[PDB]
Design a protein around this ligand. Structure first.
Ligand SMILES: CC(C)CCCCCCC[C@@H](C)CCC[C@@H](C)CCO[C@H](CO)COCC[C@@H](C)CCC[C@H](C)CCC[C@@H](C)CCCC(C)C
Ligand SMILES: *C/C=C(C)/C=C/C=C(C)/C=C/C1=C(C)CCCC1(C)C
Length: 210
């Protein structure tokens, strides 16, 4: 298990580093914003994984809290979403992570069930907006934006959807998957949803205003 935390810490660190060095010199106003957000995401995750190496897993949970909203912000800027829609998204994301925590805090099966069901519901509203709401908006924009958004959209829906699955069969849910393997799983997902995500976005010309 120490290997998963170490490997994760290194991958987040190197990603943050790459994104950080790549964005320097880049003078495009529009582009600089994507770099700021995208470098911050893996920087926050790196800090938490490094903390776990020195340390339970609620640390990684705290990182989801800060990062998921930023990843959503990245997507919203890509398709030039209006203020209202962004707020609703981050609001629902806040409920997703918040109720996920509340339920993992209640011992009675029935109460918890509802918290994690409410959490999943908020997650589905988010993915619905991204898939249906954001896609229509993206297709009315520059080809580069439409195309890069579609990939980031597909990566996000698949990866994000896997979290509740792992969690339910893991030590927090049914207790099927061992605590060490669960850690393996979440690190791969996290590295994918942030570094893999950032790589796709930042190596694309869609971030420039033109
Ligand atoms: C600048 C360098 C390159 C980075 C160097 C890293 C060295 C380690 C940092 C030292 C300090 C770390 C913060 C606390 C640690 C443990 C986290 O605690 C968990 C307990 O269930 C979660 O609580 C809730 C925790 C909340 C925290 C959310 C993340 C923030 C990111 C900053
Ligand atoms: C870098 C980290 C990312 C992208 C983390 C994403 C986490 C989620 C989408 C978590 C979702 C959950 C539910 C929908 C139900 C309750 C349990 C959670 C918190 C695992």
């Amino acid at each position: 298990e120490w290997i998963w935390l170490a490997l994760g810490t290194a991958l987040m660190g190197l990603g943050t580093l790459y994104f950080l060095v790549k964005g320097m010199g880049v003078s495009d106003p529009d582009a600089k914003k994507f770099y700021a957000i995208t470098t911050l995401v893996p920087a926050i995750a790196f800090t938490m994984y490094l903390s776990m190496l020195l340390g339970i897993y609620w640390a990684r949970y705290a990182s989801w809290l800060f990062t998921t909203p930023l990843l959503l912000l990245d997507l919203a800027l890509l398709v030039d979403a209006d203020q209202g829609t962004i707020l609703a998204l981050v609001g629902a994301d806040g409920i997703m992570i918040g109720t996920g925590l509340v339920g993992a805090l209640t011992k009675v099966y029935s109460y918890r069930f509802v918290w994690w069901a409410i959490s999943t519901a908020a997650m589905l509203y988010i993915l619905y907006v991204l898939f249906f709401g954001f896609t229509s908006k993206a297709e009315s924009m520059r080809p580069e934006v439409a195309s890069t958004f579609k990939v980031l959209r597909n990566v996000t829906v698949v990866l994000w959807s896997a979290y509740p699955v792992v969690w339910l069969i893991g030590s927090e849910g049914a207790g099927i998957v061992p605590l060490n393997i669960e850690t393996l799983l979440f690190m791969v997902l996290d590295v994918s949803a942030k570094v893999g995500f950032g790589l796709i976005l930042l190596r694309s010309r869609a971030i420039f205003g033109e």
